[PDB]
């Protein structure tokens, strides 16, 4: 039969992401000596909207430890973080909202976001708006940390993996009805070509396993 859209999407082409207006990839700092041993201070310069993303982003400026210059990082803003705020990242950073800490430095019941799946990948878990990870417990002998994920899954991560204290901002977004095809249209114009969706039953037998009748 004819190749279906589910198979046609993998070739790329007209299904690639629409990334013209995106602010940049939202990552933590590269895990360096300062964050491995002490802490480094940055300043929140602006909080911006990123096209195609529910969560707002924060632009945080740090000083380069090896060269006289500034370095700008793009974080996902946690709720309560404001412009002009001092953010502290590292092993020795305090337990305050917006700070970047290793999981082994936080107690049980701590709520984190943008959690690293492995130490150094610069954030993989709980990045969408309103989502967070809970620290279940520690296994200090294995240098491991048990966490609970937004899906309900329990995971074991290295205790050197980092996370941002607090919950991703922008929560409650999906509770408002769109009401309109046009609003769904503008939602997907900034993300990718997956809308509108034609039902497989609605098709001829050649186009889909479900077609015909």
């Amino acid at each position: 039969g004819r190749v279906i859209r589910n198979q046609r999407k993998g070739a790329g082409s007209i299904f690639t992401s629409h990334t013209r207006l995106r602010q940049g990839a939202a990552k933590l700092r590269t895990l360096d000596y300062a964050e491995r041993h002490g802490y480094i201070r940055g300043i929140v310069k602006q909080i911006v909207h990123d096209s195609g993303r529910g969560a707002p982003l924060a632009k945080v400026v740090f000083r380069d430890p090896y060269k006289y210059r500034l370095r700008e990082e793009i974080f996902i803003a946690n709720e309560g973080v404001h412009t002009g705020q001092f953010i502290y990242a590292g092993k020795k950073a305090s337990l305050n909202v917006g700070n970047v800490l290793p999981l082994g430095s936080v107690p049980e019941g701590t709520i984190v976001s943008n959690v690293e799946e492995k130490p150094g990948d610069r954030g993989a878990l709980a990045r969408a708006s309103g989502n967070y990870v809970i620290i279940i417990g520690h296994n200090p002998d294995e240098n491991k940390t048990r966490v609970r994920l937004p899906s309900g899954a329990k995971k074991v991560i290295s205790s050197d993996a980092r996370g941002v204290i607090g919950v991703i901002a922008g929560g409650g977004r999906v509770d408002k009805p769109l009401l309109k095809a046009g609003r769904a249209f503008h939602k997907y114009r900034l993300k990718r070509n997956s809308w509108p969706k034609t039902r497989g039953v609605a098709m001829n037998p050649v186009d889909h396993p479900h077609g015909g009748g």
């Binding site: 480094i40 090896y66 006289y68």
Partner: peptide, 9 residues
């Protein structure tokens, strides 16, 4: 020349 201080030599 501690962490978070002057540029490293």
């Amino acid at each position: 020349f501690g962490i978070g201080q002057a540029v490293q030599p």
